[model samples]
Target: NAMSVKIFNSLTKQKEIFKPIESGKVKLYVCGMTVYDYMHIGHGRSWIIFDMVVRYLRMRGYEVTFVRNITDIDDKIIKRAGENKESPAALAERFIQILHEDEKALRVLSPDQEPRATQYVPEIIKLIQKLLDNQYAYTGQNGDVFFDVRRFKDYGKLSHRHLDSKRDPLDFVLWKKAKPGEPKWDSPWGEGRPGWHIECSAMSSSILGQPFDIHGGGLDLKFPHHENEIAQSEAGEEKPFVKLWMHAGLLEINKEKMSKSLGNIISIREALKESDVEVLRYFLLSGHYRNPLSYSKENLENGRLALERFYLALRGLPVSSYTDRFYEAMDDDFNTPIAFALLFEMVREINRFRDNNQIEKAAVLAAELKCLGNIFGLLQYSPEQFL
Candidate 1:
């Protein structure tokens, strides 16, 4: 209870102390992948960051319930399935399995509740119905349900976009009418499926309830995706949606945006083939979570060697304290760069103690180093295997 954690809330655009809704418990919901494609390094970055957060919070003695949603039904999935000559469900299931493989390879902790959008149609319909009843949403002539952005006074509160739609440019769909050969679910409006934004609001609230402790995603989702979530949830629930908004900085390749158009996008499996899994995780966490991380062979090689240093210090040492300095670095907005730096400092100390033939002191520091590194999903493999 004495531990204090500060998070840089995207909503406030500043760091704020994290206070759970209930005593000694933390509720977290993070936007998940759309499942139309393979798991990319960018997606890996966000999930790894949140995994560290969950581990750190639990290490600090807070009971954390993490919910990460999977967007199994989406425009992209339908399109890709059409191209691949498969059903949308089959396509999503394939990639969902690949996502699990990638997460296991990187050692990212599985979320406590992983809700898929298609499985929660009933809840999504009820949420859309609530919004419609509250006059925050309206239906189009073609049986499309759209959230009336103008009806929500705080529509742009999250993105701070000083704000239309299918009705206005600001308006976004709540339900999309079914097209031939596409997935659809029956709703009050018509046979249709929930729109992209509405799925998170419904799935998250159904699991964690509104006004949860923390909601997070990649930085790219800060605009329409996250802002829309706030509008729909608040307007429908008549209360705040989430206390803290955490967005992990995006991943870049060679100082350029990594996109399919640029022909530079790298998948998690591809990256794993090039480097050790822990080294990949280390390179991902080498930078602060809120800052852009650039991926390249050189940077990954540097990560490989850097991790080698930590393992070298830990090699041939008998495992034995937690370091407050490590916690201090992490407590301030999950600053992994500083936390990693502190680990390297301990690595140096362990080396110095070993040089002086102080095995007891060296072993103690090595144990602390591994303990702190494990919180970041690093230093798991034995030195023999890693080296």
Candidate 2:
């Protein structure tokens, strides 16, 4: 039985069995939203997948310390705030609240710590100082502190980019010299703000400690974003960082990437307007986490009906506890698709026993179904709320 949990590490590009640094404990860090606008269905997919991952781990009896950071101060947030005639801080604060609403609708649990970028400015400076002391970073002519990608021996390991020579062209900024009228913090390189990548490196190491269990984000970030994270954390800390790098696949519409020009960008609140949040959640999980999810009206309708089937079967059952053979399916890389198939079959058995007036048998199956769904953070609504 392959009942032990396994995860596909994007870094190693292999499905290795998961084991925490400490006995029965896990430290998971997920890159959260930039807080510049309303969260789209694409953002929802990444967070939801990780959220389910955390829930399933907890159910497996691991004391998980989950940290999802809020990128509060960034170039995007600054530009968007200027467009809206609001301060950058004000804009970030507004969307942070809205992001919480989106998370609540998806029934995602709040992380143990949700550190904001702006909240860790002092810590970010100290990290850059450490990198400079280690000779892995330098001051550019523009007064910006640039991380010498060339200095890091394994610069492109996470993104799997082959580095050819000493002067690699991928050096990134650690501290950006603040422009006039923009937000700035005191730094050794004069007043500046942390670069988009370094803020995460600082927060993750400061909060979770080094050599954490897993680091996760959208597939799009695997390259420069995650690649840079790997370089800086390992270079600064002088130790290995994340044990596993997990990336959720992108979401698409009409077989194309979600984009502004195509007008296919659906906001999280907008999607919730037409269908139940759980239906959207089900659609997100129906596909493998590392594969692109296509969104459409027809697909959402299918998910809604699927969710109704489980709720309908368990409508009158009393609260009881149980597990099933499907537990192995869940452990196999968090195989939600197979878990769902097991669920559909389990519900059918419950309905069959009910139709035959086998009330006791039906109740037993229903309880088992609820227990399984709870593990995935599904089947949450009571019969009254759902039906």
Candidate 3:
């Protein structure tokens, strides 16, 4: 069964069989977005992929303790706050609220734990101190603490880069010394805030234990952020910190990476307003999680139609039997095409039953459709809303 679960591992550069450290229980950690601005499709893409993984794993009888950390206190939030003339706290809260709205629109399940960096200062500080005590990290004269990458032999294994060339990793800061009018936290090292990567290392390990089951995020995070997460974690106490490294691909407009500054970044809020949330969810699930998917109005409309047809077929019926071919499709690398095809077949049969006045047959079809919908997060809406 473990061999049947496969995801394209960014670290290994190939599809790798999933092998959980502990059988029957999965601990997943996905790097969440920094709370600075409204969440865009890129963020949505990453979120939905992990959400699908969580739900699918659960459906297969595995207990998952999913954790996604929020970067509440960060340089991006501070800079955006300054530009908007809003306090960092106010700005971060505003965007966080919007992020919630977006996820709810997508019908995503909330992570089992959503830890914030600001609240985990003690954990972060303690981890940093561990690195210091181990001589894996050093405090600069400027109060900036940097991890000594050379101390960790497999510093580049996650990214498959050179261990020595990654020693400085271009000199990443572990802790930022407090600056005037900036965020401040009391720590054994000094009075400052945790670095972006260190926050995750400390927060994830504090809650999920050392070497979590899965570490995932957008492909953009494979380097620097995730790379540093490994650096800080390994430098302290975790060897081969995460059991599996998974990364979802990014969104591209006209085949170019969309940046917030690029003026083409589409937020989930705007996209939801234009189409049904179910359609958006289908688009996200339509492709392999690792493949880059282009957003288009045509696909959204089709997803809506496909789902609506599924509902229409179950309009009338009595009770019968339901089978689970769903397992076969999902087990094949989470192939949605195969899964959706099965639904369409069910749709066709359901429609035939409806026309023939086979009430019991239709009822059986209805139950089957509902069961399949559970796997895909469709047909869960109000009947009126489905229209």
Which model scores highest in lDDT? Answer: 1
Model 2 scores a TM of 0.95
Candidate 3 whole-model C-alpha lDDT, 0 to 1: 0.80
Candidate 1: misplaced stretches above 4 Å?
1-3, 320-322
RMSD of model 3 against the true structure = 2.7
- TM-score-wise, the better of 1 and 3 is 1
lDDT of 3 by residue, 11-119 (tens): 7777677777898889999999789988888888888888888888998888999999889989988899999998899998898888788788788899989999989
Candidate ranking under TM-score, highest first, comes to 1, 2, 3
Worst 10 residues of 1 by lDDT: 161-170
The lDDT for every candidate, in the order shown, is 0.88, 0.87, 0.80
Show where candidate 3 strays beyond 4 Å.
1-4, 163-169, 316-323, 382-384
- Between candidates 2 and 3, which one is better according to lDDT? 2
Please rank every candidate by lDDT, starting with the best: 1, 2, 3
Error of 2 at 373 (Å): 1.1
* C-alpha RMSD by candidate, in order: 1.5, 2.2, 2.7
Q: Candidate 1 lDDT, tens digit per residue, 1-387?
A: 355889898889998888889999999999999898988999989988999999999999899999999899899999999999999999999999988888888888889999999889999888888898999999787778888988887878887778422778778889998898778898778887888888999999899977899999999999899999999999988999999999999899999999889999898889888888889889988799999989998999999899888888888888722478878888899888888888888888899999999999999777778888888888988888877
Question: Of the pair 1 and 2, which is ahead by lDDT?
Answer: 1
